[PDB]
Amino acid sequence: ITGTSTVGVGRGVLGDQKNINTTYSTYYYLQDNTRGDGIFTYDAKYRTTLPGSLWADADNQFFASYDAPAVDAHYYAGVTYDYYKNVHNRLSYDGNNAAIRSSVHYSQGYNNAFWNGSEMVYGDGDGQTFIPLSGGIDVVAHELTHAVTDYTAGLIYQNESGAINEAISDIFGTLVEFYANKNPDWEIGEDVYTPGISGDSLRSMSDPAKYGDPDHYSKRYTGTQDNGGVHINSGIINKAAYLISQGGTHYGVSVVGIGRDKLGKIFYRALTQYLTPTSNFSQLRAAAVQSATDLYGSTSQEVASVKQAFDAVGVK
Ligand SMILES: [Ca+2]
Ligand SMILES: [Ca+2]
Ligand SMILES: [Ca+2]
Ligand SMILES: [Ca+2]
Ligand SMILES: [Cl-]
Ligand SMILES: [Cl-]
Ligand SMILES: [Cl-]
Ligand code: NA
Ligand SMILES: [Zn+2]
Ligand SMILES: [Zn+2]
């Protein structure tokens, strides 16, 4: 909508304070004009029709507990935007500065968040399994990365392709978490999962077996549930990306870590230049090796670490 660009202040789902870009027209709306064609955050008001109402606040202060999920959906959509723009020169999810629309307070006790093809959607959680899902920057960026994947490789959401699709979202979710630089780790959804239980998460990239996910191709899940195990087999590729960055010795294979920024450069290039809708794990390894070759040279340490990390997780 039309109005003046303003800066409000509020508290997100975890109780931290942050500034947010708003637009003033009688009310202050969660409409950020500083990023592409805008970031817009809506109240679904516990209904399921979308997008709901552009979020309106009387005084540009967002400290009510009802406001927190909106503060975070809005602010982390901006962080994710800044990551892809500043780090990879990609303008919004479609590379053309598409508006990022998010709705919060979707449904009641809904234990999930998703990119729906047009917008982000956040449940509040039931307060036991989850608190409002926008509170997790890695969740926000994981879901927005599905949009990136859709506009690039178009990985099919089933079997190994689908597990690469999930891993790509976990990888870039994590890298946005590190980019934001507040409380980053290699776990997924730690900030919003199970508020009664400290130290857990939905999955771990550094040790997938901690939550029962495979960390080696010989352990891949071959059943039909979860679209052929897409949130399960992602552990194989997560662990490989973790090793490329941090290094380590995994099933007796030594990997020299090359750090997060080079992990990102390599996987982004693989995603945008080499993956196709039906890429499998072996083709991902080839894509990552070619990407590292493009960027660092075929005799580089970077290319050797990519090979080591894939060998370590049994993907030839
Ligand atoms: Ca207010
Ligand atoms: Ca974290
Ligand atoms: Ca995390
Ligand atoms: Ca927890
Ligand atoms: Cl917070
Ligand atoms: Cl998902
Ligand atoms: Cl190879
Ligand atoms: Na699990
Ligand atoms: Zn996902
Ligand atoms: Zn290990």
Swiss-Prot record:
Designated name of the protein: Thermolysin
Cofactor annotation remark: Binds 4 Ca(2+) ions per subunit. Binds 1 zinc ion per subunit.
Source organism phylogeny: Bacteria, Bacillati, Bacillota, Bacilli, Bacillales
Subcellular location: Secreted
The gene coding this protein: npr
Stated role: Extracellular zinc metalloprotease.
Cofactor: Ca(2+); Zn(2+)
Enzyme class name: hydrolase
Binding-site residues, Ca(2+) 2: 138, 177, 185, 187, 190
